[PDB]
Amino acid sequence: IKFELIDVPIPQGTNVIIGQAHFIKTVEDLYEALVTSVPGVKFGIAFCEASGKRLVRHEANDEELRNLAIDLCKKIAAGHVFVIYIRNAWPINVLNAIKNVPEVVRIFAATANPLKVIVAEVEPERRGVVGVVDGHSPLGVETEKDREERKKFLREVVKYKL
Amino acid sequence: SIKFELIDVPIPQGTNVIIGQAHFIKTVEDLYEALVTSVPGVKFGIAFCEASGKRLVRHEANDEELRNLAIDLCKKIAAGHVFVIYIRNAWPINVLNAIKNVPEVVRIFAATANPLKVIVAEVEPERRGVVGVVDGHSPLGVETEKDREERKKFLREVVKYKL
Amino acid sequence: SIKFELIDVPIPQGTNVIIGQAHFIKTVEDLYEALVTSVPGVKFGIAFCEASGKRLVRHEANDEELRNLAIDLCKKIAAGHVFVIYIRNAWPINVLNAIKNVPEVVRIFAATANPLKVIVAEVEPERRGVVGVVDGHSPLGVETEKDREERKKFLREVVKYKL
Amino acid sequence: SIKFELIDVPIPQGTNVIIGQAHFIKTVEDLYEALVTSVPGVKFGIAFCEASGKRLVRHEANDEELRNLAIDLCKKIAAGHVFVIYIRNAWPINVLNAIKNVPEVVRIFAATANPLKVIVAEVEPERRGVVGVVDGHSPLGVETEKDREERKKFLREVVKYKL
Amino acid sequence: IKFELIDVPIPQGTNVIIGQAHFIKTVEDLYEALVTSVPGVKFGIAFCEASGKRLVRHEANDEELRNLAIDLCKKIAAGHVFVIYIRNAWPINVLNAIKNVPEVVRIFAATANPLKVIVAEVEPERRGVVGVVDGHSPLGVETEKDREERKKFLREVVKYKL
Amino acid sequence: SIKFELIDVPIPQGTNVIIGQAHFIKTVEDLYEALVTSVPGVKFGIAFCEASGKRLVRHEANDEELRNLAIDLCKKIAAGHVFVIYIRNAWPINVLNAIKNVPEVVRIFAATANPLKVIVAEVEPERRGVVGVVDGHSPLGVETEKDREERKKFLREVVKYKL
Ligand SMILES: Nc1ncnc2c1ncn2[C@@H]1O[C@H](CO)[C@@H](O)[C@H]1O
Ligand SMILES: Nc1ncnc2c1ncn2[C@@H]1O[C@H](CO)[C@@H](O)[C@H]1O
Ligand SMILES: Nc1ncnc2c1ncn2[C@@H]1O[C@H](CO)[C@@H](O)[C@H]1O
Ligand SMILES: Nc1ncnc2c1ncn2[C@@H]1O[C@H](CO)[C@@H](O)[C@H]1O
Ligand SMILES: Nc1ncnc2c1ncn2[C@@H]1O[C@H](CO)[C@@H](O)[C@H]1O
Ligand SMILES: Nc1ncnc2c1ncn2[C@@H]1O[C@H](CO)[C@@H](O)[C@H]1O
């Protein structure tokens, strides 16, 4: 076993969702999950066909997001992984829909942080995803006042709680 | 320190395998029920590695070949709370969302009929877990627009899962 | 270039732990609500590893013991976006599905009261990922038709989860 | 040649009722399982109108008071494929998502402790269907910013379902 | 407000599923829910487009079942109602997928019993479903002997329980 | 006997209406969060008829036009535990599955921008429930292969929801 670290580019205003699925129908099912989630949303989806032609398959509505999706696919280089990049939507806007796509088996990351995918290579052409490093270690525990500012952020800034 | 081990997963033609991790003894009867209620003709085996107490591989089936594949696989992986399902006469897409929703199922590793290996970490004597999976082969290149059009044709005219 | 470290998870009698990965600071509030609306008189603590900005283990609880258990285990794992929940007077099967459905939550690694280690990779300093769990111990043998009866009756007559 | 009839629904203090439509005789063990696996020490009784064959009200319970209250609603409503559940030590919120996901359940009409009526149509003798429910009473006015602040306080400080 | 009783034709070997949805996309989404549930299923699905062209939209893989579908729509004749007829699958095989189709708002019946739909016409051309009459009323309460024999059945015959 | 009323539902260009039944007072807050966290732009107004105690129509909103539409329809329906949502900059399919999953939500009556009528049954003074809706118009005929081609191209070329 060889462990390789695959660094994920996230231009600002993007988020990436990286996970695993199966069956070629994953790329059309994911295009439809995203496109029926948020009017407006801009995305690229790529999926690593793990057999047959073994082609990186893709759908997008934005060209920059299609190339990003497709190059992470080629960098990860691991059968059945999929990569989504989104603009004009947050992951929480589309997560549950992705989760319920019957091809989707698991999701490794949903984020905009600094992000590494840990890949095992066990033999040439035989790769899998072993984990992610989504952002950074803690610096401390939150205090009573860090709490207030997080509660006030949710209610006053992004308005997701009352 | 930590030992990594690679398990080759037997996939007789016409089978698919679903590997996951769950908890609690009720896993095995709840998976059994997920499966049987999903596709009228479904043939399956299911095995679950009980991680405490007696620590037996619990199983159910309506096929003996598939029951046996499932138990061997759990004997090879030998990781607490891991389960193994082998299926004939259903595709994983037919069954997978009902597995996800089984209250004991925390996680699913793989669902495939490709060449497949499991990465198991064994950290101590008799203390193993799944690190991950190698599902088929890495990519040979990028789909062209003409590639897209045969896969679209495949989905609409061959398997008819699309209009 | 990768260090694997093993984090042993304390589970005092009567508590189960749930470990997974999420994203976004609303994670702590949504998790709290999923816990408290699931079972009356559940007690629990939940801690979340905010992966950037101030970088704080964020927490909620209605039990002081179970709170510090969770804050502590996040302090030790030290991996961005990991959440840990400890619960009494609730089984993980009474709360898990709600947990799966929290939009922030992306994966669950373990729900258990077994002996448990989390294997963590560190790639640079400060930069850590949960790679897997070792939930309990490996199988000691296959179940026989008598051990099957034991397990069926225990579900029927003792915990009363099946008819 | 349609008559409607109103069925009043007894709800003793500390119970809630759930009434729905389903199908197939497994409805009753599936709803059994859905309830007990949701909350430790929930008390309940569940009844279901089998609409073909021997046409028997089918039932399961861990409380005889709740089980008779459920059978009696079934016998009144007297509509094929309807189910009634009465529960103590659990709120409809602790259990509704699992009920909705039971593959036999097609709709839920009410989950409530309020005063309740079921509107039933009878199209022929022995042929009946639920048309509606009357759950509690019609509004008296519109919430003021002050009523709002007291409802914010009730969910945060009293019940603790929000933060 | 006139109430009108529609009798639903159920051929030996079919089941019927009748609900309410919205938006034209309903018909493709229902077709995909069905065909990705059970490999062998034959079905017909029809949807009552409630605006615009206002037409019965259908998809099928069985002409008989396709027509049974269109025929019950034409009778209920109520905006946004959909009808599905299935051979070689049971409702439990598909129901949850159908629940989670974003266009689907309610399901009124899933069954193979003698069945009536109650339709309210409030205005000409303005109709909606008010209920169903799914088979017949209870003839008695289960005994424990009856309970044993239903449990034996689920366990030994349909094999859905252990 | 029973009094059936017809409530004509106003739907401005650009809005849609979602009408349903829930229970418990936390329904207004949970509906609010299900909307704000489904789509970044979404403008809406939510109202809910509490059906016991104070019996107030409870409301949350970020659009004063749409708050007023939802409160006014609740006042017109005047049926305990019914809820109304008006939304702009989001289609029902964007938010619906989320609504279906709010533990309080028992059922959904309608999701539409079509001419819409709610049929209410008043059964004694102040006891009202929803018996049905009339969502747009009955069929003008049956789709041909010409119109199916046009429909398939509408989904794939105009809205881009299909491929
Ligand atoms: N026709 C099909 N319908 C559904 N799933 C399929 C089909 N063909 C293959 N699969 C699944 O997709 C994987 C990759 O092709 C296979 O290993 C199998 O698991
Ligand atoms: N306002 C927001 N709404 C939804 N998700 C967000 C928001 N801000 C940040 N996130 C997500 O959470 C992570 C920050 O914790 C980001 O990388 C991003 O994925
Ligand atoms: N009575 C019970 N109900 C639900 N879950 C349980 C019960 N007993 C044990 N478990 C779970 O199953 C695991 C043992 O297989 C335990 O670690 C615990 O998490
Ligand atoms: N073995 C079975 N599996 C699934 N559904 C069934 C079965 N038998 C009957 N049904 C359904 O249950 C209804 C009768 O309760 C039938 O009309 C049919 O819809
Ligand atoms: N482009 C679209 N995307 C999503 N939903 C739509 C669209 N157009 C119409 N609808 C919904 O479908 C109903 C029209 O049948 C409308 O009333 C509206 O609720
Ligand atoms: N604290 C509570 N938690 C959950 N559900 C509640 C609570 N109080 C009341 N309810 C439910 O809501 C109704 C009050 O509208 C009651 O009939 C009951 O169903």
Describe this entry's structure for a reader.
Chains B, C, D, F: Keywords: Nucleotide-binding. Chains B, C, D, F: Adenosine binds at residues 16, 24, 91, 113-114, 161. Chains B, C, D, F: AMP binds at residues 16, 24, 52, 91, 113, 161. Chains B, C, D, F: GO terms for molecular function: nucleotide binding. 6 copies of one chain form a homohexamer. With 162 residues, chain A is of the alpha+beta class. Chain A has a single domain (1-162), classed as Ta1353-like (hypothetical protein tt1634). Chain A is 29% helix and 36% strand. The first copy, chain A, is built from 4 helices and 9 strands. In chain A, the strands form 2 sheets. Chain A has a 5-stranded antiparallel beta sheet with strand order 4-3-5-2-6, with helices on both faces. In chain A, strands 1-7-8 form a 3-stranded antiparallel beta sheet, covered by helices on one side. The longest helix of chain A is centred in the middle third of the chain and has 14 residues, at 63-76. The first copy, chain A, is globular and about 55 Å long. The termini of chain A are far apart. Chains in contact: A-B, A-C, A-D, A-E, A-F, B-C, B-D, B-E, B-F, C-D, C-E, C-F, D-E, D-F, E-F. The interface between E and F is large, with 41 and 41 residues. One adenosine (ADN) sits between chains A (15, 90-92, 111-113, 158) and C (23-25).
